[PDB]
Design a protein around this ligand. Structure first.
Ligand SMILES: CCCCCCCC/C=C\CCCCCCCC(=O)OC[C@@H](O)COP(=O)(O)OCC[N+](C)(C)C
Ligand SMILES: *[C@@H]1O[C@H](CO)[C@@H](O)[C@H](O)[C@H]1NC(C)=O
Ligand SMILES: *[C@@H]1O[C@H](CO)[C@@H](O)[C@H](O)[C@H]1NC(C)=O
Lengths: 98, 243, 263, 201
């Protein structure tokens, strides 16, 4: 059976330009486990993206936390790219600047 | 085939060293060396959770061990003391059994440590013919066997009728007697009965033998005495039936 | 809710103190890896060796049983078995244990006290699987011993060992914001409460002391350092927000509630 | 103190139900074992149970009661064949290092039921050269107890049961001897409490 991932993007601290924040992408509630997640900076992947070990909830669906350190800028926008079996095509969810 | 211990008896002089070998072919991970003194239960000397490692038990002082293969577990004494006089049991079990806990045990090694090997003596053995009064009164005949004068208490007594060992009708003392209760180095005496029907005894074809297997000095032990070296040996006494 | 649990996926095995990962498995050496110095709990090096070995022996015999009955039961390669097992402590009560198995993404069979019972959903196929798992009761006793004895002794020593990390209080940082509009003429007000520990937190939108009942909690969301992030929202009409405020309550605050005004 | 077993010894009559017990103080005990050890043999595992409950195996019943911290081995219709030392052993929950604690053991003797006693003292001559003699006290019931010699020149053994299997006939027996000359059968067991009907040929 298949379950589509819920994709949520957020920052460890409130957005400020002169501060090294952390960008999070919390992907959850999906099945099966195989999934590709990328954090995008200006529409291009970031190389140093760490991520948590795979785990699941009581309904047996999987979840993952992708994160990365970053100093953001005013003319800077960041997103989350998820590709899964349950998606006809790769899904992009961007970061809410405010 | 089970757990095997070698040797089964040993006499040491104070200061000497020996090694006991335990062996099992059951592919068991855990192996143990216990000692049993009256009046106590088993106490753990050393044990091993697998090939290559060993660990201390309750009373490890004065002993060492070796886990050479899965199969073998060695107990060593480097300098024997009177307090190590005891019976030593080896045991083994799987790490994680599928048929419940509990361990398999060897048959025991009796080790007696002595200050002086000159104190060792083989038994003398004598068979006593059944009372004629008994025979006519109960229509049974009891033969008695005496093993006297042996030290240490390392004997196995057995009855042999017509060249075959027998077990039915036999009773051997569980513990020997000190011939001289005042001495620590007292030599022991042991008795055993064999009761047969009076028919069987009054026959002159039937041959009755009392055998004592004694365990004493290894062939390697130094002996500078007039009397014969009190080695491990068998002593017997026999009798034929009489009408 | 004080729980410790282990998860198998069929390959990854790991140990979790709720949301916090504490142990991971190394197949390269068949040993248990400690993510925190205090992951060792109150167990000794000897005891961990024993447990290392215990899991290796059992993990193997188990996933080899499946392969043994692969054809006899269901679907062949590829397959996904998920297992979760553990204990939870209750103040005053008897500790809970659980061990559950999922076949693909659905409940399959679980361990109740000392034996395996199928889920009704999984139908007749799970029944056959439990006749297989229950044939040797001694194997079941061991499972039981780990779940309802080993595990609770451990989770105690573990909580004790990591008090300075688990009993830690990290104050939250809070700010107000708009969200995406619910619809024409209306605003979604957002209260962001960020970076706090431990997890229990109370957030509520408030016109004066009147709690707004339309306050919606979102998911509690994680970040890498173990702290938490939560959004509390409220949909109000355009001119009806000037006198509203978000109130945050937390153990780290020790009395002093955070109060933010929309103003 | 961790495992307490009644030392005994126990001497019970054949046919009686026998109860061997241990108490323990460690509530972490979870694996309970009974071993039987015949004289000068190794312990053989007799019964094992996991945690609370009763397991029955023929004339044996093993019981563990964890709230009382009290375990028992019952033997129905005890036979002379049951005479042995009984050791209990216990292990804590995993991980337990594979170790178990043993109680110091209970020695059990099951006295045979002597159907037709005929107590008597016989004299036995060496098959070899004379001057040495042996005194046999045989065929008494199990209630009779044989006392030691109270004389350094005479040796006297304990009561001992022999089983003539092919007749289902059992008998008790004790032996006395001495190098001393005045030594006589009539006075050999004077310090023991002998049956009046004891025959002296
Ligand atoms: C990363 C590890 C973390 C280490 C922390 C552990 C220390 C705390 C203690 C316990 C943790 C709780 C989990 C214990 C439960 C694990 C259960 C467990 O491992 O046992 C399950 C057994 O029943 C397996 O039985 P089988 O051998 O497979 O039966 C044969 C049948 N066949 C068809 C499968 C071949
Ligand atoms: C763990 O602590 C328990 C009680 O909290 C204690 O019984 C035990 O000695 C400790 N474990 C060790 C020292 O291995
Ligand atoms: C649960 O299982 C344990 C261990 O097998 C057993 O001792 C106990 O009697 C059982 N209790 C119930 C209520 O089933």
């Amino acid at each position: 059976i298949q379950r589509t991932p819920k994709i949520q993007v957020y920052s460890r601290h409130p957005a400020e330009n002169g501060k090294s924040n952390f960008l999070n992408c919390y992907v959850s509630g999906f099945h099966p486990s195989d999934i590709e997640v990328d954090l995008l900076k200006n529409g291009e992947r970031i190389e140093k993206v760490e991520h948590s070990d795979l785990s699941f909830s009581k309904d047996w669906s999987f979840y993952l936390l992708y994160y990365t350190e970053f100093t953001p800028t005013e003319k800077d926008e960041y997103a989350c790219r998820v590709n899964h079996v349950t998606l006809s095509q790769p899904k992009i969810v961007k970061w809410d600047r405010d | 085939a089970g757990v095997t211990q070698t040797p089964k008896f040993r006499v040491l002089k104070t200061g000497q060293s020996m090694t006991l070998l335990c062996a099992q072919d059951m592919n068991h991970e855990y192996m143990y060396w216990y000692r049993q003194d009256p009046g106590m239960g088993l106490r753990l000397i050393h044990y091993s959770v697998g090939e290559g490692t060993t660990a201390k038990g309750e009373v490890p002082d004065g002993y060492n061990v070796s886990r050479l293969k899965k199969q073998n577990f060695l107990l060593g004494l480097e300098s024997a003391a009177p307090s190590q006089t005891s019976v030593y049991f080896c045991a083994s079990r799987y790490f994680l059994p599928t048929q419940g806990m509990g361990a398999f045990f060897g048959q025991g090694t009796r080790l007696t440590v002595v200050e002086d090997l000159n104190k060792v003596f083989p038994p003398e053995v004598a068979v006593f013919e059944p009372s004629e009064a008994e025979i006519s009164h109960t229509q049974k005949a009891t033969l008695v066997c005496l093993a006297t004068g042996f030290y240490p208490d390392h004997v196995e007594l057995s009855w042999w009728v017509n060249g075959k060992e027998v077990h039915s009708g036999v009773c051997t003392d569980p513990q020997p007697l000190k011939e001289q209760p005042a001495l620590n180095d007292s030599r022991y005496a042991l008795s055993s009965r064999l009761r047969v029907s009076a028919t069987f005894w009054q026959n002159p074809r039937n041959h009755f033998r009392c055998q004592v297997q004694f365990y004493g000095l290894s062939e390697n032990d130094e002996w500078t005495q007039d009397r014969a070296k009190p080695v491990t040996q068998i002593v017997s006494a026999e009798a034929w039936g009489r009408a | 809710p004080l729980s410790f649990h282990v998860i198998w996926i069929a390959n990854l095995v790991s140990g979790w103190l709720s949301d916090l990962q504490t142990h991971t498995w190394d197949s390269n050496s068949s040993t248990i890896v400690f993510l925190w110095p205090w992951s060792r709990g109150n167990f000794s090096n000897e005891e961990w060796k024993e447990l290392e070995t215990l899991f290796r022996i059992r993990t193997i015999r188990s996933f080899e049983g499946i392969r043994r009955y692969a054809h006899e039961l269901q679907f062949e390669y590829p397959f996904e078995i998920q297992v979760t097992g553990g204990c939870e402590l209750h103040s005053g009560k008897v500790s809970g244990s659980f061990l559950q198995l999922a076949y693909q993404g659905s409940d399959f069979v679980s361990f109740q006290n000392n034996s395996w019972l199928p889920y009704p959903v999984a139908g007749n196929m799970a029944k056959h699987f439990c006749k297989v798992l229950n044939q040797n009761q001694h194997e079941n006793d061991i499972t039981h011993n780990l779940l309802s004895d080993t595990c609770p002794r451990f989770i105690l020593g573990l909580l004790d060992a990591g008090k300075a990390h688990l009993q830690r209080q990290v104050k939250p940082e809070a700010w107000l914001s708009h969200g995406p509009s619910p619809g024409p003429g209306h605003l979604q007000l957002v209260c962001h409460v960020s970076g706090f520990y431990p997890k229990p937190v109370w957030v509520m939108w408030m016109r004066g002391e009147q709690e707004q009942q339309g306050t919606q909690r979102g998911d509690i969301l994680p970040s890498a350092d173990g702290t938490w992030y939560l959004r509390a929202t409220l949909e109000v009409a355009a001119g009806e927000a000037a006198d509203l405020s978000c109130r945050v309550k937390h153990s780290s605050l020790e009395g002093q509630d955070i109060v933010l005004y929309w103003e | 103190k961790e495992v307490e077993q009644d030392p005994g010894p126990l001497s019970v009559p054949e046919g009686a139900i026998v109860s061997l017990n241990c108490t323990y103080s460690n509530s972490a005990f979870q694996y309970f074992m009974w071993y039987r050890q015949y004289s000068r043999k190794g312990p053989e595992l007799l019964m094992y149970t996991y945690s609370s409950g009763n397991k029955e195996d023929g004339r044996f019943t093993a019981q563990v009661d964890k709230s009382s911290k009290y375990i028992s081995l019952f033997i129905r219709d005890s036979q002379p064949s049951d005479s042995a030392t009984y050791l209990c052993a216990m292990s804590t929950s995993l991980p337990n290092a594979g170790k178990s604690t043993f109680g110091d053991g209970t020695t059990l003797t099951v006295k045979p039921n002597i159907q037709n006693p005929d107590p008597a003292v016989y004299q036995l001559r060496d098959s070899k050269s004379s001057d040495k003699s042996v005194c046999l006290f045989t065929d008494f019931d199990s209630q009779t107890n044989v006392s030691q010699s109270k004389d350094s020149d005479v040796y006297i053994t304990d009561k001992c049961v022999l089983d003539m299997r092919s007749m289902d006939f059992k008998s008790n027996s004790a032996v006395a001897w001495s190098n001393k000359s005045d030594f006589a059968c009539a006075n050999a067991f004077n310090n023991s409490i002998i049956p009046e009907d004891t025959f002296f040929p």
